[PDB]
């Protein structure tokens, strides 16, 4: 019973680790196009601010 | 930062930021198998190296002027001439840099707190020197709209964009022992002990109105500590009260609620010697440590479905002195920092259950992934000198590696905030409802399984043939002359 | 790695060696004094003075109590490391080209060159030591055995002992390697024919169960002691003077080069005699490390695998401390297999 | 700093025949085998502990190897300047001379082109080429007050860290803070003992280099060995007579009987005489030249053994020279212990714990250790020092043993069993801590190192907070610190800059303000140095009578001053022969009187450098007055300045009218901390008057004694004492609520107002030391008032 609970705990922990890692990887992949768009907008603003200064 | 995170092949984690390997300030990834070194740059900093809040710039100390190292392959794009400086820190929105000289020169005269605007590249202000207390002595608001410092008899409030003086005034309030800005727009929590005619109080003040919106007198207190929740939802105050025997007899927790009408107050706790408190990141649970039992006791608190926040679990007494929570809320580290052994214990939450307990010989320093996957802990050579190392570990209870480092100075992860967050992303996180899922990780492991093939096979065969040759000689030698083969000279 | 440069010798280097704990480095050159250096910072600890000729070989015992040198002046000397004094000299009828201690420090061999009419030989000497202090008590003026050049081989040029001193392995001026059985009165056991030129170095793996050869014929061979099977071949376009097997990582370091002579070297191209690192198992060149102004004549690796030193025909020793990129250097199948563990 | 001139100087020195000769001797030292490992470890680590026995060569060769490496090898350090601290003046001077010789320097330390120098209190031997400085720990601490980062120093070496002195431990706290601020500073800790782990741990587990080294072995004989070898028989009727551990079964039944029945609570002086006679008879020791050093718990046992040696026919010959070494003796009599005896004469030095640390007698070969001391205990509730000490610690006994073995092999005879030694405590109770902390607290505040409480909490062994509070209360009472804050007053800033006790420093500053600096600097030198009065063995009553013939104004302080004036006169009028004749007639140490002149001139220079000039119009003391007795008015002023420095040390004379004219009753004094007797060496021992006594020190021996006393009058106490209360109805004036004077109410109010005037003038003068007070009406009236009290 101790070995069974230890195996079930290890499997639950391993499944939790994978879920968190895959969730963060998925969030980052969906964020890439937004980061690129935000970089283009920031580059325009920095260029306008430089020209104005 | 974001681009590199997409393009680069691995599998699967964070970027550093290492002081230690060699006489060099050095760049690494987290490639699961090892951290792989990207660069090692000889004498890049002359004291300490600091990241910008999104990791955008690297702030590098040179004794002839602080430098902001930018561009993908790293060069100085901006450098600020202030010597005698040791403190070199940003506004939380990456727009302004504050430099402080605790060593007077004729650089400061006597304007030792110098504020540099990153967007222009110019010194906007200097403010004359300081004696008290912990850095930051001059504290920004979350938006970077306001900036302030205490005079003991008067709070002075300074204003972005030009670093003016708010209302053309400073707020004549006396006896302040510390002040903390809210994450929420825009509020200061500050507190006053027994000052002559005035009994002790905690004040919540709104700005730019400048009104003491919630004051509570606390009465006869040795000390208090003001702990904001990370979104500004709550202010917890940790209050140590005094009987007529002149003792710190009992710690109380009193929680102000800031979204709720007319700022109601949850009085929660009464207990012996509370030495640490920490909120759940982005949430509403909390964990607490109590002294003198004679090992340190741990108490765990959750929010009830009927309202109030209340004790829910405890665990037996331990060596943990520092409570360090994951940015993803679930995992909390209970760490006995500055102990020779053990002393790192790991708890999964809701309903606080201990997952693992591990080594880190002479542990000093501790940090997490911004999304909670990895823990890194280190032993600075400024702190300790019997092992000197960094230790890298996965949230589960699996060590990745421990790498001893010869005169180890520092480790810091490069910041990586989640780029956007929304109701549909929060919905996608709930999609598989709770049971298991099998959509992503099995495909990444299949990709890794593909990475064992095509020219790879001949090399796998070579590795194998070598291990076999070696086992054969290993056997023979044990039998013939009782000798154990090795690849490095034993201790 | 980071490198610093040790200068002391004004003459081409002939041998560098680390001691067992890897905190001292010993070197000899065509000068008549040897030097001892701290391997941490390259500071010179002191010198060994008394020979009158090039010192070809230096070795240090497993206790770091004595080192032994072989010289062009037709002598071998034994030195006390803590005060740099000579405690014993043997005279030789021929120059001595190489010396090495047995793994436990009770014997050393010396290669006696085949000059004038001498056929050459590997001499074995015994040092009787106090079992507590490891100080010597007796040295005999005679070797306790002389392995005269075997019938059919040219003279030995290099030799070393295998694990527990059970075999002596030798390399010869005709590119052969031969093996001698220490228990059986050093009798000839076997030989292999590897190189088209003389064997210029031969060094052992950390456990002494295999070794690596090098030759000016551009090739290097990894060879098993017990069978003399050739395990690996590293093929170069460069005449080699020296080679080593690294601890910790599965790497090989090779070194040699061809003196420039008549062609002009530009300032951009100066300092480009290199050591080449190969992967031991895959036989693949993985790096070249520059810094020398003439051929590399000797390379040594610390037994901890944390630095290496090279001595050049330029009269310098470059001392190298490995960095994190070196320790983490891994083929993709090596990352895979190291993770398969857990 | 262009090092090339100094590198070229060193290369020239290395070519000298002197350097090459001494290099061959240096190569024989144990530490030389570790030269390259020491240098390489110091390159890799900012802090290193170097542990190894005395005589291994550490203190000479570790600083030398570091100097050699920094000059010859292009280390990335742009700077080569090494400081090596020593607890002892003689060690700083002798090590610098030895290393200067080993460097091939011809002019000695601080000579032209000398790479090595030394600096001790009142003596500096360094030049612009000096890159290795040996100094006393308190010299480096003063340099830290001038340069808080030691900006011009590259390497600090703290030697003899195992002595665990207050100044060493204090320096280690400061150096730990500087090592956090400066990445370029290196620290070496040198120890003779094996507790290198505590120092390693305290500096973040820094590397320990263990140098295997004998050097200069001391053979140890325990009480059982001494009894066996001497043939000593314990007589059953002797005052030393009061399952024997199986360990003793190897000794004779006589020795077993002597060990079983010998009183462990008495020092067997008869066994010391037999042991001394055995050293001359024994074939083992008879041919060994050297001095014998005997550790005794105090002056009474020194006298008892001196009398036994003087009366014993075995020791009556010109073959022995018996010398006492005790804290009570003059600096000249203490200096006699360092003089070599004539050839064939055995020197016997009878010493307390004064020989146990900080002092080196180079010719000691034999140590006799009684294993006993007398120790100062401070009682906080009474503010009294008591002298009551028992067995020494193991650390103390090993340091006594190590008095043999310094220059050559030696012998240590322990007048206690091996088992008794094994049962000694390892360390004495708070060697650094048990002492008063006021000078330490003053120094902490002078260096702006925070509160004394918070700073001392960081010590290896923190003192009790009550000791710190008491020390701070004394600094507040003196006026060195503000009343509510740990901040130095202008007086405190001047006191912290003077190399003397706060009470003596206040006396010097007041001596300058009252324009009496020359006599007061002589009194200050007398209070800091050993008494010039000697009491030669067997001539006590003649020495006491000669001191009484010099007695001045019922004051020990003015009696010593009068002795100095008469010596100065004898030297000026009759030269060297008159000087010696005066010293011999009055039992004075000439060397002590010379040191008093040197210390006086330097104290005057330091007070003048602080801006306190003596007025050029008082030609009264600087010009030719070696021929005049002090006027009564000058005596009154000197007593007043003594009270201004020492007021915390006042007591009321308990006059008891003797019934019997023949009983010389000792003068009894009531102090704020209880009753005491005037010490028998005082001219006031038999003082039979009502009044007030000032004292320098209150010490517990068998009784509580007041040392170095002065009879004082009311006006000094009223002007410079603690709080004045006026009892208008009773016509009584109280000072600190316990000192009572009968005064008309108007006179009592006058003194209360005169203090406000004094404090106003003193404050202005302490804030601006260069301000002239010559025409100050207030100072003139106070000086006139003090001068009138005895008319």
DSSP calls for A15-52: HHHHHHHHHHHHHHHHHHHHHHHHHHHHHHHHHHHHHH
User: Closest Cα to residue D267, out of D294, D290, D307?
Assistant: D294
> Which chains, if any, share at least 3 CB pairs under 8 A with chain D?
B, C
B32 CB neighbours in chain A (<8 A) are none
CA distance B437 to chain A (A): 7
B383 CB neighbours in chain D (<8 A) are 204
Cα B144 from Cα B148, distance rounded (Å): 11
Residue D32 at interface with chain C, using a CB cutoff of 8 Å: yes
Cα D553 from Cα D519, distance rounded (Å): 15
Radius of gyration of chain C (CA): 19
**Tokens 């360990």 — which residue?**
D247
Cα D737 from Cα D714, distance rounded (Å): 15
Vertex D707: Cα angle to D705 and D710 (nearest 5):
120
Which strand (E) or helix (H) includes residue D384? Answer: strand D384-387
Helix (H, G, I), strand (E, B) or coil at D645: helix
> Which chains, if any, share at least 3 CB pairs under 8 A with chain A?
B
Cα B11 from Cα A25, distance rounded (Å): 10
User: Closest Cα to residue B26, out of B406, B417, B418, B416?
Assistant: B406
User: Closest Cα to residue D146, out of D447, D409, D383, D402?
Assistant: D447
Residues C176 and C192: beta-carbon distance below 8 Å? yes
Least CB–CB distance from B120: residue in A19, A22, A53:
A53
Using CA atoms, how far residue C221 sits from C86, C231, C243, C309, D563, in Å, is: 37, 7, 10, 21, 95
- Please spell the DSSP secondary structure of D280-321, one letter per residue: HHSTTTTT---EEEEE-SSHHHHHHHHHHHHH-TTT-STTEE
Which residues 425-454 in chain B show a CB within 8 A of chain C?
Answer: 448, 451-452
- Asked if A touches C (at least 3 Cβ pairs < 8 angstroms), the answer reads no
Return the sign of the alpha-carbon dihedral for residues A19, A20, A21, A24. Answer: positive
State residue B168 phi and psi, 5-degree precision. 55, 40
**Tokens read off for B42:** 């000889």
The answer to the question of whether D52 is labelled as a binding residue is yes
Residue B1 half-sphere exposure, CB side, CA atoms within 13 Å?
A: 23
Looking at the DSSP bridge assignments, the partners of residue D712 are D692
Residues D694 and D709: beta-carbon distance below 8 Å? yes
Q: CB burial class (10 A; 0-12, 13-18, 19+) of residue D74?
A: exposed
B487 CB neighbours in chain C (<8 A) are 205-207, 247-248
**Tokens read off for D286:** 């008879």
B/e letters for D614-637, b = 16+ CB within 10 Å, e = fewer, are: beeeeeeeeeeeeeeebeebbbbb
Residue B36 at interface with chain C, using a CB cutoff of 8 Å: yes
Vertex D318: Cα angle to D313 and D320 (nearest 5):
75
User: Closest Cα to residue D166, out of D157, D178, D174?
Assistant: D174
- Asked if B touches C (at least 3 Cβ pairs < 8 angstroms), the answer reads yes
The residue of D148, D197, D204, D208 whose CB has the most chain B CBs within 10 angstroms, and thus the best one to mutate to test that interface, is D204
Distance of CA D265 to the CA centre of its chain: 30
Looking at the DSSP bridge assignments, the partners of residue B392 are B376, B401
Cα D760 from Cα D762, distance rounded (Å): 6
Least CB–CB distance from D206: residue in B47, B383, B385:
B385
Cα C168 from Cα B183, distance rounded (Å): 75
User: Closest Cα to residue B441, out of D426, A20, C163, C24?
Assistant: A20
Cis amide prior to D17 (ω within 30 degrees): no
Using CA atoms, how far residue D203 sits from B382, C178, D144, D173, D175, in Å, is: 10, 55, 20, 10, 10
Cα D568 from Cα C175, distance rounded (Å): 96
CA distance B414 to chain D (A): 26
Which strand (E) or helix (H) includes residue D52? Answer: strand D47-52
User: Closest Cα to residue B309, out of B254, B263, B238?
Assistant: B254
Cα D533 from Cα D593, distance rounded (Å): 10
Please list, in sequence order, all residues whose beta carbon lies within 8 angstroms of the beta carbon of residue B87, skipping any fewer than 6 positions away. Answer: B98, B99, B100, B102, B135
Helix (H, G, I), strand (E, B) or coil at C35: strand
Cα B202 from Cα B398, distance rounded (Å): 43
Residues B140 and B160: beta-carbon distance below 8 Å? no
State residue B334 phi and psi, 5-degree precision. -105, 110
Residue C40 at interface with chain D, using a CB cutoff of 8 Å: yes
Least CB–CB distance from C163: residue in B18, B22, B477:
B477
The answer to the question of whether D578 is labelled as a binding residue is no
Vertex D367: Cα angle to D366 and D369 (nearest 5):
155
CA distance B33 to chain C (A): 6
Alpha helices (H) along D104-233: 137-146, 166-181, 196-202, 223-230
**Tokens read off for B256:** 């102000």
CB–CB contact C325 B22 (8 Å)? no
User: Closest Cα to residue D774, out of D621, D626, D638, D616?
Assistant: D616
Cα D214 from Cα D217, distance rounded (Å): 6
Please list, in sequence order, all residues whose beta carbon lies within 8 angstroms of the beta carbon of residue C293, skipping any fewer than 6 positions away. Answer: C270, C271, C273, C312, C314, C316
Residues D580 and D567: beta-carbon distance below 8 Å? no
Please name the residue of chain D whose CA is at the shortest distance from the CA of residue B379: D204
Q: CB burial class (10 A; 0-12, 13-18, 19+) of residue C178?
A: buried
The residue of B402, B404, B447, B459 whose CB has the most chain C CBs within 10 angstroms, and thus the best one to mutate to test that interface, is B459
C36 CB neighbours in chain D (<8 A) are 36
Please name the residue of chain A whose CA is at the shortest distance from the CA of residue B329: A20
The answer to the question of whether D405 is labelled as a binding residue is no
Residues B191 and B202: beta-carbon distance below 8 Å? yes
Please list, in sequence order, all residues whose beta carbon lies within 8 angstroms of the beta carbon of residue D21, skipping any fewer than 6 positions away. Answer: none
Helix (H, G, I), strand (E, B) or coil at D432: coil
**Tokens read off for D33:** 């085998």
CB–CB contact B385 D180 (8 Å)? no
CB–CB contact B481 C163 (8 Å)? yes
Helix (H, G, I), strand (E, B) or coil at D143: helix
Residues D375 and D388: beta-carbon distance below 8 Å? yes
**Tokens 């915390």 — which residue?**
D648
SS (HEC) of chain B: CHHHHHHCCCCCEEEEEEECCCCEEEEEEECCCCCCEEEEEECCCCCCEEECCCCCCEEECCCCCEEEEECCCCEEEEEECCCCCCEEEECCCCCEEEEECCCCCCCCCCCCEEEEECCCCEEEEEECCCCCCCCCCCEECCCCCEEEEEECCEEEEEECCCCEEHHHCCECCCCCCEEEECCCCCEEEEEECCECCECCEEEEEECCCCEEEEEEECCCEEEEEEEECCCCCEEEEEEEECCCCCCCCEEEEEEEECCCCCCCEEEEEEECCEEEEEECCCCCCEEEEECCCCCEEEEEEEECCCCCEEEEEEEEEECCCEEEECCCCCEEEEECCCCCCCEEEEEECCCCEEEEEEECCCCCEEEECCCCCEEEEECCCCCCCCCCEEEEEECCCEEEEEEECCCCCEEEECCCCCCCCCHHHHHHCCCCCCCCCCCCHHHHHHHHHHCCCCCHHHHHHHHHHHHHHHHHHHHHHHHHHCCCCCCCCCC
Cα D635 from Cα D562, distance rounded (Å): 11
The answer to the question of whether D55 is labelled as a binding residue is yes
Question: B-D interface: how many C-beta pairs under 8 angstroms?
Answer: 13
Residue B327 at interface with chain A, using a CB cutoff of 8 Å: no
Residue C250 at interface with chain D, using a CB cutoff of 8 Å: no
User: Closest Cα to residue D371, out of D251, D498, D210, D223?
Assistant: D223
Distance of CA D136 to the CA centre of its chain: 13
Residues C23 and C43: beta-carbon distance below 8 Å? no
Cα D782 from Cα D791, distance rounded (Å): 15
Residues C236 and C218: beta-carbon distance below 8 Å? yes
Cα D100 from Cα B111, distance rounded (Å): 49
Using CA atoms, how far residue B278 sits from B149, B209, B411, C263, D341, in Å, is: 25, 30, 23, 72, 76
Cα D132 from Cα D178, distance rounded (Å): 20
**Tokens read off for D416:** 């206690």
Least CB–CB distance from B386: residue in D44, D180, D205:
D205
Helix (H, G, I), strand (E, B) or coil at C16: strand
Residues B238 and B257: beta-carbon distance below 8 Å? no
The answer to the question of whether D789 is labelled as a binding residue is no
Which residues 60-119 in chain D show a CB within 8 A of chain C?
Answer: 69, 73
Checking DSSP bridges between strand D116-120 and strand D132-136, what pairing results, if any? parallel
Cα D128 from Cα D617, distance rounded (Å): 40
Residues B439 and C323: beta-carbon distance below 8 Å? no
**Tokens 């000497």 — which residue?**
C125
Vertex B221: Cα angle to B219 and B227 (nearest 5):
105
CA distance C188 to chain B (A): 20
B/e letters for D167-198, b = 16+ CB within 10 Å, e = fewer, are: bbbbbbbbbeebbeeeeebbbbbbbbbebbee
Cα D390 from Cα B450, distance rounded (Å): 82
Residue C79 at interface with chain D, using a CB cutoff of 8 Å: no
Return the sign of the alpha-carbon dihedral for residues D526, D529, D532, D538. Answer: positive
Cα B79 from Cα B93, distance rounded (Å): 19
Cα B60 from Cα B47, distance rounded (Å): 8
Cα B276 from Cα B322, distance rounded (Å): 7
Residue A32 at interface with chain B, using a CB cutoff of 8 Å: yes
Helix (H, G, I), strand (E, B) or coil at D105: coil
The answer to the question of whether D56 is labelled as a binding residue is yes
Cα B428 from Cα B416, distance rounded (Å): 21
Residue B395 at interface with chain A, using a CB cutoff of 8 Å: yes
B423 CB neighbours in chain A (<8 A) are none
SS (HEC) of D668-719: EEEECCEEEEECCCCCCCCCCCCCEEEEEEEEECCCEEEEEEEEECHHHHHH
Residues D242 and D262: beta-carbon distance below 8 Å? yes
Which residues 31-90 in chain D show a CB within 8 A of chain B?
Answer: 44
Residues D518 and D622: beta-carbon distance below 8 Å? yes
**Tokens read off for D570:** 């004898």
Cα C113 from Cα C158, distance rounded (Å): 10
**Tokens read off for D699:** 């010490």
Residue C206 at interface with chain B, using a CB cutoff of 8 Å: yes
CB–CB contact B33 C339 (8 Å)? yes
Angle between helical axes of D590-609 and D517-528 (0-180°, round to 10): 120
Please list, in sequence order, all residues whose beta carbon lies within 8 angstroms of the beta carbon of residue B148, skipping any fewer than 6 positions away. Answer: B138, B139, B155, B156, B157, B158, B179, B188
């Amino acid at each position: 019973q101790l070995e069974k609970e230890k195996k079930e705990l290890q499997e639950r922990l391993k499944n939790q680790e994978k879920k968190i890692d895959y969730f963060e990887r998925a969030k980052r992949l969906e964020e890439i196009p937004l980061i690129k768009s935000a970089y283009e907008e920031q580059r325009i603003k920095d260029m306008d601010l430089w020209e104005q200064q | 930062n974001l681009r590199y995170w997409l393009e680069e092949a691995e599998c699967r984690d964070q970027y550093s930021v290492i002081f230690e390997s060699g006489d060099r300030t050095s760049i690494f990834w987290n490639d699961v198998k090892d951290p792989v070194s990207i660069e090692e740059r000889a004498r890049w900093t002359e004291t300490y190296v600091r990241w910008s809040p999104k990791g955008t710039y690297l702030a590098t100390f040179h004794q002839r002027g602080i430098a902001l190292w930018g561009g993908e392959k790293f060069k100085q794009i901006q450098r600020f001439s202030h010597q005698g400086v040791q403190l070199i820190d940003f506004s939380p929105c990456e727009r302004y840099l504050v430099t402080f000289s605790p060593l007077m020169d004729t650089q400061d005269d006597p304007q030792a707190i110098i504020i540099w605007d990153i967007l222009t590249g110019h010194k906007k202000r200097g403010f004359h020197c300081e004696s008290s207390a912990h850095w930051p002595i001059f504290k920004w608001s979350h938006d970077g709209k306001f900036f302030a410092r205490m005079t003991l008899d008067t709070l002075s409030i300074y204003e972005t964009p030009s670093m003016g003086l708010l209302d053309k005034k400073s707020l004549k309030i006396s006896g302040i022992k510390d002040f903390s800005w809210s994450p929420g727009g825009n509020i200061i929590a500050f507190w006053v002990p027994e000052d002559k005619d005035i009994p002790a109080r905690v004040t919540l003040m709104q700005l730019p109105s400048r009104q003491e919106i919630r004051v509570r007198n606390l009465f006869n207190v040795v000390d208090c500590k003001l702990h904001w929740q990370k979104n500004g939802d709550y202010l917890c105050v940790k209050v140590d009260r005094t009987p007529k025997g002149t003792q710190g007899v009992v710690t109380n927790f009193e929680i102000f609620r800031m979204r709720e009408k007319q700022v109601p107050v949850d009085v929660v706790e009464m207990k012996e010697t509370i030495i640490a408190f920490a909120w759940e990141p982005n949430g509403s649970k909390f964990a607490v440590l109590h002294g003198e039992a004679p090992r340190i006791s741990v108490s765990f608190y959750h929010v009830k479905s009927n309202g109030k926040i209340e004790l829910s679990k405890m665990f037996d007494k331990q060596q943990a002195n520092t409570i360090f929570w994951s940015p993803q809320g679930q995992f909390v580290v209970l760490a006995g920092l500055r102990s020779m052994n053990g002393a790192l214990a790991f708890v999964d939450t809701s309903d606080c259950t201990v997952m693992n307990i591990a080594e880190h010989y002479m542990a000093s320093d501790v940090e997490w992934d911004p999304t909670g996957r990895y823990v890194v802990t280190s032993v600075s050579w400024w702190s300790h000198k019997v092992d000197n190392a960094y230790w890298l570990w996965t949230f589960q209870g699996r060590l990745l590696q421990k790498n001893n480092k010869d005169r180890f100075c520092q480790l810091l992860w490069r910041p990586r905030p989640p780029t956007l967050l929304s109701q549909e992303q929060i919905k996608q996180i709930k999609k598989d409802l709770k049971k298991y899922s099998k959509i992503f990780e099995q495909k990444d492991r299949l990709s890794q399984s593909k990475a064992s093939k095509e020219l790879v096979e001949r090399r796998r065969a070579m590795m194998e043939d070598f291990r076999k040759y070696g086992k054969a000689a290993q056997e023979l030698y044990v039998g013939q002359k009782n000798e154990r083969l090795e690849l490095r000279g034993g201790v | 790695m980071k490198a610093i440069k040790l200068t002391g010798h004004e003459r081409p280097l002939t041998q560098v060696k680390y001691n067992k704990e890897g905190d001292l480095l010993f070197s000899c050159s065509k000068d008549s004094s040897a030097s001892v250096w701290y391997s941490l910072n390259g500071e010179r600890l002191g010198t060994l003075d008394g020979h009158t000729g090039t010192i070809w070989s230096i070795d240090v015992d497993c206790f770091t109590k004595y080192c032994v040198t072989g010289s062009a002046d037709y002598s071998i000397k034994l030195w006390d490391v803590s005060n740099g004094q000579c405690v014993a000299t043997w005279k030789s009828p021929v120059p001595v080209k190489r010396v090495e201690f047995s793994p436990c420090g009770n014997y050393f061999l010396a290669i006696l060159d085949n000059v004038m009419k001498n056929p050459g030989s590997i001499n074995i000497y015994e040092i009787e030591r106090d079992s507590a202090t490891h100080e010597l008590t007796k040295v005999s003026e005679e070797p306790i055995h002389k392995i005269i050049t075997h019938e059919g081989l040219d003279a030995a040029t290099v030799a070393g002992w295998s694990t527990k001193g059970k075999y002596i392995i030798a390399g010869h001026k005709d590119g052969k390697i031969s093996k001698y059985d220490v228990s059986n009165n050093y009798e000839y056991v076997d030989s292999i024919d590897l190189h088209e030129k003389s064997i210029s170095d031969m060094q052992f793996s950390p456990d002494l169960t295999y070794f690596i050869t090098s030759s000016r014929d551009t090739n290097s061979f990894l060879v098993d002691v017990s069978t003399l099977q050739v395990l690996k071949k590293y093929e170069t376009d460069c005449p080699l003077n020296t080679a080593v097997i690294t601890p910790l990582k599965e790497f090989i370091i090779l070194g040699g080069g061809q003196e420039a002579k008549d062609v002009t070297t530009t300032s951009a191209n100066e300092g480009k005699f290199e050591a080449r690192f190969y992967h031991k198992i895959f036989e693949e060149e993985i790096g070249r490390v520059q810094g020398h102004f003439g051929p590399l004549n000797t390379v040594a690796i610390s037994p901890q695998g944390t630095s290496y030193a090279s001595g050049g025909e330029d009269g310098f020793i470059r001392l190298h401390h490995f960095e994190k990129s070196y320790f983490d250097f891994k083929y993709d199948v090596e990352k895979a297999a190291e993770a398969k563990e857990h | 700093e262009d090092l090339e001139p100094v590198r070229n100087l060193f290369r020239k020195l290395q070519s000298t025949p002197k350097y090459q000769k001494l290099l061959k001797e240096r190569q024989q030292l144990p530490v030389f085998k570790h030269r390259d490992s020491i240098v390489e470890t110091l390159k890799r680590h900012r802090v290193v502990v170097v542990a190894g026995e005395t005589g291994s060569g550490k203190s000479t060769q570790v600083p030398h190897f570091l100097l050699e490496d920094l000059l010859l090898n292009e280390w990335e350090a742009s700077k080569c300047n090494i400081v090596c601290t020593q607890p002892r003046r003689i060690s700083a001077v002798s090590l610098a001379n030895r290393v200067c010789d080993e460097l091939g320097c011809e002019n000695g330390p601080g000579g032209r082109n000398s790479l090595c120098g030394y600096q001790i209190r009142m003596e500096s031997r360094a030049c612009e080429s000096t890159r290795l400085l040996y100094c006393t720990t308190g010299v480096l601490l003063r340099k830290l007050q001038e340069d808080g980062l030691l900006s011009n120093v590259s390497h600090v070496i703290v030697d003899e860290v195992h002595e665990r002195s207050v100044q060493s431990d204090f320096l280690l706290i400061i150096l730990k803070e500087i090592l956090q601020k400066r990445s370029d500073l290196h620290l070496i800790l040198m120890s003779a003992t094996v507790d290198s782990e505590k120092f390693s741990t305290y500096f973040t587990h820094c590397p320990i280099l263990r140098i295997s080294g004998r050097s200069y072995p001391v053979e140890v004989f325990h009480l059982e060995d001494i009894i066996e070898e001497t043939g000593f028989v314990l007589e059953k009727d002797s005052e030393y007579c009061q399952d024997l551990n199986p360990f003793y079964q190897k000794y004779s039944s006589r020795t077993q009987h002597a060990i079983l029945y010998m009183n462990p609570h008495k020092i067997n002086l008869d066994l010391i005489l037999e042991l001394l006679a055995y050293l001359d008879k024994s074939p083992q020791f008879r041919n060994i030249e050297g001095a014998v050093l005997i550790f005794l718990p105090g002056l009474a046992h020194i006298q008892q053994l001196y009398d036994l040696l003087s009366n014993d026919r075995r020791f009556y010959s010109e073959r022995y020279k018996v010398i006492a070494l005790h804290s009570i003796l003059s600096t000249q009599d203490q200096a006699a212990a360092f003089t070599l005896p004539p050839p064939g004469v055995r020197k016997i030095v009878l010493a307390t714990n004064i020989a146990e640390t900080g002092i080196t007698i180079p010719d000691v070969v034999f140590v006799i250790d009684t294993g006993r001391t007398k120790e100062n205990k401070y009682h906080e509730s009474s503010q009294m020092s008591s002298l009551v000490e028992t067995f020494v610690s193991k650390a103390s006994a090993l340091q006594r043993q190590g008095r043999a073995g310094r220059v050559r092999d030696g012998f240590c005879f322990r007048m206690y069993t091996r088992e008794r030694f094994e049962g000694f405590m390892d360390y004495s109770v708070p060697e650094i801590l048990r002492v008063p902390l006021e000078e330490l607290c003053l120094h902490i505040m002078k260096c702006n190192l925070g509160s004394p409480e918070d700073f001392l909490s960081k010590a290896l062994d923190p003192p009790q907070l009550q000791v710190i509070s008491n020390a701070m209360n004394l600094l507040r009472k003196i006026g060195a610190c503000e009343l509510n804050e740990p901040k130095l007053t202008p007086l405190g800033q001047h006191l912290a800059a003077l190399p003397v006790n706060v009470k003596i420093g206040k006396m010097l500053i007041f001596g300058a303000i009252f324009g009496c600096l020359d006599p007061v600097a002589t009194l200050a030198a007398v209070m800091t140095e050993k008494s010039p009065f000697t009491t030669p063995i067997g001539r006590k009553d003649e020495a006491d009578l000669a001191k009484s013939a010099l007695a001045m104004a019922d004051s020990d302080h003015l009696t010593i001053y009068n002795a100095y004036l008469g010596w100065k006169k004898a030297r000026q009028e009759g030269g060297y022969r008159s000087e010696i004749t005066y010293c011999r007639r009055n039992f004075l140490n000439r060397t002590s009187l010379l040191t008093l002149e040197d210390v006086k001139q330097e104290l005057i220079k330091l007070v003048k450098a602080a801006g306190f000039s003596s007025s050029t119009t008082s030609t009264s003391w600087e010009g030719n007055r070696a021929s005049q007795t002090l006027s009564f008015q000058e005596i009154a002023l000197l007593k007043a300045v003594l009270v201004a420095g020492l007021y915390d040390n006042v007591g009321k004379i308990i006059y008891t009218k003797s019934v019997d004219v023949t009983e010389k009753l000792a003068c009894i004094v009531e102090t704020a901390q209880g009753k005491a007797q005037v010490h028998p060496s005082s001219v006031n021992r038999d003082l039979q008057t009502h009044g007030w006594l000032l004292y320098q020190e209150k010490i517990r021996y068998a009784r509580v004694y007041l040392r170095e006393t002065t009879l004082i009058t009311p006006f000094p106490v009223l002007l410079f004492g603690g709080d004045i209360e006026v009892q208008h109805r009773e016509r009584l004036l109280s000072i600190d609520g316990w000192i009572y004077f009968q005064a008309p109410v108007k006179i009592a109010v006058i003194f209360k107002q005169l203090r406000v005037l004094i404090d106003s003038v003193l404050r202005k003068k302490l804030e601006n030391p260069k301000m002239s007070l010559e025409n100050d009406k207030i100072l003139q009236i106070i000086t006139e008032l003090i001068k009138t009290e005895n008319n």
